[PDB]
């Protein structure tokens, strides 16, 4: 089903950039940045914003973003994108 | 032209709107609409389990699931899908 394919895409995208350096299930900054710039063009602004973004997602604090912390991100970006396209104008 | 990640996110939002706009508030899932979503979008869903899924997701207690509460479901399911692999 469409929903199931979508969650499959979220998993596959994560590992497509998570499996490039070191632990193939955790995103280091080079992999997080790679995911952000390639999958979310324009999400970064403002002096290095990439540091801020792992600082917020790295919940346990090991310097890498795993799947659950990455899902915390996808969720917030999904709800904001929804409010932007689905308002009782 | 969105990215693969972006396309997938759109699908989630679209799926929710696909069942949310059937009756009542076009931006909230009623009990009947929630049943419809589970049965069509989750190939494994067995079944009153919908009541459980309602009381579990209805954080604010209005009797309907809005988007912010439906993402709680999608997120929990996504990590659960990832565990299964
Ligand atoms: Ca890695
Ligand atoms: Ca972490
Ligand atoms: Ca509705
Ligand atoms: Ca609610």
Swiss-Prot record, chain B:
Post-translational note: Glutathionylated; glutathionylation increases affinity to calcium about 10-fold.
Keywords, ordered alphabetically: Calcium, Cytoplasm, Glutathionylation, Metal-binding, Mitochondrion, Repeat, S-nitrosylation, Sarcoplasmic reticulum
Protein localization: Cytoplasm; Sarcoplasmic reticulum; Mitochondrion
Chain sites annotated for binding Ca(2+) 2: 58, 60, 62, 64, 69
GO BP terms, alphabetized: intracellular signal transduction; negative regulation of transcription by RNA polymerase II; positive regulation of sprouting angiogenesis; regulation of heart contraction; substantia nigra development; vasodilation
GO CC, any one term: protein-containing complex
Record: residues binding Ca(2+) 1: 28, 33
Primary subcellular site in the record, as a coarse category: cytoplasm
Function: Small calcium binding protein that plays important roles in several biological processes such as Ca(2+) homeostasis, chondrocyte biology and cardiomyocyte regulation. In response to an increase in intracellular Ca(2+) levels, binds calcium which triggers conformational changes. These changes allow interactions with specific target proteins and modulate their activity.
Identification of the protein by name: Protein S100-A1
Annotated organism of origin: Homo sapiens (Human)
Gene: S100A1
